[PDB]
Each structure stands twice: as structure tokens, then as C-alpha cells.
Design an enzyme around this catalytic site. Sequence first.
Site, PDB file in Angstrom:
ATOM      1  CG  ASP A 107       3.572   9.841  -4.362  1.00  0.00           C
ATOM      2  OD1 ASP A 107       3.213   9.045  -3.470  1.00  0.00           O
ATOM      3  OD2 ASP A 107       4.703   9.802  -4.888  1.00  0.00           O
TER       4      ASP A 107
ATOM      5  CG  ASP B  53      10.960   1.755   1.466  1.00  0.00           C
ATOM      6  OD1 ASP B  53       9.872   1.477   1.991  1.00  0.00           O
ATOM      7  OD2 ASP B  53      11.140   2.784   0.788  1.00  0.00           O
TER       8      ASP B  53
END
Length: 234
Positions: A125, A7
Site C-alpha cells: 500500500d 474478496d
Amino acid sequence: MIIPALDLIGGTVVRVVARLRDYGNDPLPRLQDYAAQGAGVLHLVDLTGAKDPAKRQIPLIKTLVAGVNVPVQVGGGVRTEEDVAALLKAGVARVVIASTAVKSPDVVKGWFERFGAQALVLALDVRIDEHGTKQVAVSGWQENSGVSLEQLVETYLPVGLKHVLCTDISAGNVSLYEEVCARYPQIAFQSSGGIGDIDDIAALRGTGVRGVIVGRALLEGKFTVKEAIQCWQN
């Protein structure tokens, strides 16, 4: 395969816990060492671009892709056709489409038609609800949107969906991946989250999951990419 992940925010490698820990401004050597250990795919999340697409880290992404010899899939703030095209032009192998895949499926179906299914990864998700349904949500802090993982997958099968990344947001569940992978054997599923140690990788062998995204455990030095691959392939 194992898919090592970073990230990135403003050039900085960070660990998501929402808490953020600084792991330095050296993403290129990190990525190069992941590839050196046998990784065939890498995963990047542009957190700056996710906050503001205008500030997409295209120059950094260009450098990173140029600096390794393996395909990189990149997500973060992919909202428009222009976003997808910009990332691909920067040298990204696959663009990770997240919220927009839930929000505007007819639009994203057009992206499959333009760019091809090899260029796109749908990142969903999932929350398992009280009934046991795999509920899709656009993020961990928002409510479910009212569509199941199966329903959304089946929306995109007619345009040749090939890559789906599934993060369980409800040590790491195995049943979730067994179920979906069996139901859609023509799709290569990636699992994200819940990898805290090497045994978590072992647990996903035989489920039918194609790719295992590993991020924080590599940063924390729990195991190496080489060890992850050895466990994954055995």
C-alpha cells in the site's frame, strides 16, 4: 493483463467500500465466468484468514482453484512460511504477501529462496506524502512505516523479486505507476484500486503497468471482464 478480483469472507463475495456489501455465496461461477471471458490470472483476498489465519479458507480456496483453468493469486493473513506452503499445497499459483513483506524482509527473503519468485507477489500500500515520496504503509488505517516503495523494492531485488502489487491509498496516480515501472523494468507491477469505469483502465495503458486488478467495478456491473481486456489490449 486484466486481473479480476474477489474478496471472500466466510464463503461470501463482498465489496469493500470499512463497509461491506454482500454479493452472494457464489464465488465459483463468478470466477469461472471471469476466466471464460479471457482472464489469464485471478486474484482472491481471504478476509477471514486475514482476521484469523487459523480460519484460513483453505477448503474453499481448493475448490475455487480446482474450478478454474487459470492461475489464482491469493492473499489474506500470510504471516508464516507455513501459511505460504499451505496455500501453495491447496493449488494457489502465487501467494500475495502484504504486511509481512514490510514487517520482516529478511524472513520473506528466505521465502523467495525456498518457494521461488514466481510463487510470490509483494503487495504494498502506498501513500504519496507532502514531499511526493511514495510511502509504504501496511494498511489504509495505519500510519506509514517509514520506508519508500523504491527502498522496499530494492530490498527484494537481490532475491529475484518479479511481482509487485501496488495500491494507492492516498476514478483513478498514473504518474506513480509510470515512475516505478520505468525505474524497475525487470519487475511486473500490478495496480489495484481506483478502477471505477472503463476509462480508468485506458488511463493505465502505456504506463508500463503489467497487471490491472479489477474488483468492485465488475461486481457493480460497470463493465465486463471481456470489455476490460479489449480496452487494455487496445
